[PDB]
Design a protein around this ligand. Structure first.
Ligand SMILES: COC(=O)c1cnc(N2CCN(C(=O)c3ccc(-c4nc5cccc(C(N)=O)c5[nH]4)cc3)CC2)nc1
Ligand SMILES: OC[C@H]1O[C@@](CO)(O[C@H]2O[C@H](CO)[C@@H](O)[C@H](O)[C@H]2O)[C@@H](O)[C@@H]1O
Length: 241
């Protein structure tokens, strides 16, 4: 007899793959609410998904199954220093389903100091995209179980260190709060809207006019866990072609 709505129950079953559903819910230390399918929030999120699928990520199309509003215990209190920092953006973060119990209970985390920098294009930090398909690739979704989880997070970017090439270090110059990896393609900035004082870059991909960058698409990195406030969790269907 769980009192949770069916979509939340199915999300819990997916994350934990056991204890009663309500016992597993309490382990996430996260308020989870279903966003109404006919709400303005849902419409904005579906537009963000539709508009920001990269043309080079054509292995699958995405369909939104369920949208959840999430509030991790203590996370808004932790974010207070960054809350009116200029340049807050609603950005994607994808991950394996098997990581989501950890992400909801502990939040997005940075690799420990001992960890090697190998493969971290912009060093040990928390990585986000403005193109849903770039983040969806980090779900590692299989044809055999074509359902993935992706976050939308409010990221306090402040003053961005704009880079066109990999730098494997995690230390920013004084007064810089984030790295923007400059892609060849960017959501049309003339379609950017604000949702609760946060920029949502849900424009269709156009050419950035940046030349001599190694990135097809933007990415955004912060180096302090307190610069992230997770807002939504989407369950997506991957329709492979
Ligand atoms: C064996 O040595 C190697 O050759 C080697 C090579 N690579 C490695 N490693 C590869 C990099 N390592 C990471 O954990 C790591 C994982 C994910 C990203 C990442 N980038 C994103 C950009 C936009 C959005 C998202 C998103 N999730 O929405 C992004 N996520 C970045 C880094 C560490 C492990 N380790 C070792
Ligand atoms: O501020 C949060 C976070 O940003 C870093 C850079 O990753 O430092 C920036 O912000 C500091 C406090 O506002 C400034 O003192 C600093 O100049 C600036 O680079 C991290 O050190 C910090 O945890």
């Amino acid at each position: 007899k769980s009192k949770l709505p069916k979509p939340v129950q199915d999300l819990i079953k997916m994350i934990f793959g056991g204890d009663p559903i309500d016992v597993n819910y309490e382990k996430l230390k996260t308020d989870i609410k279903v966003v109404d399918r006919d709400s303005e929030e849902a419409e904005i999120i579906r537009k963000y998904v539709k508009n920001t699928h990269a043309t080079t990520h054509n292995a699958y199309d995405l369909e939104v199954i369920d949208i959840f509003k999430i509030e991790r215990e203590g996370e808004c209190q932790r974010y207070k220093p960054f809350k009116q920092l200029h340049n807050r953006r609603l950005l994607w973060h994808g991950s394996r389903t098997t990581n989501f119990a950890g992400i909801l209970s502990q939040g997005l985390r940075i690799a420990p100091p001992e960890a090697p920098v190998t493969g971290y294009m912009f060093g040990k930090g928390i990585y986000f995209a403005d193109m849903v398909s770039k983040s969806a690739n980090y779900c590692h979704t299989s044809q055999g179980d074509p359902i993935g989880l992706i976050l939308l997070g409010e990221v306090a970017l402040g003053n961005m260190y704009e880079l066109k090439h990999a730098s494997h270090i995690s230390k920013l110059p004084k007064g810089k709060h984030s790295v923007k990896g400059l892609g060849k393609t960017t959501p049309d900035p003339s379609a950017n809207i604000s949702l609760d004082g946060v920029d949502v870059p849900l424009g269709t991909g156009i050419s950035s006019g940046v030349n001599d960058t190694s990135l097809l698409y933007n990415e955004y990195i912060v180096y302090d866990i307190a610069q992230v406030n997770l807002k939504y969790l989407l369950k997506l269907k991957f329709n492979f072609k």
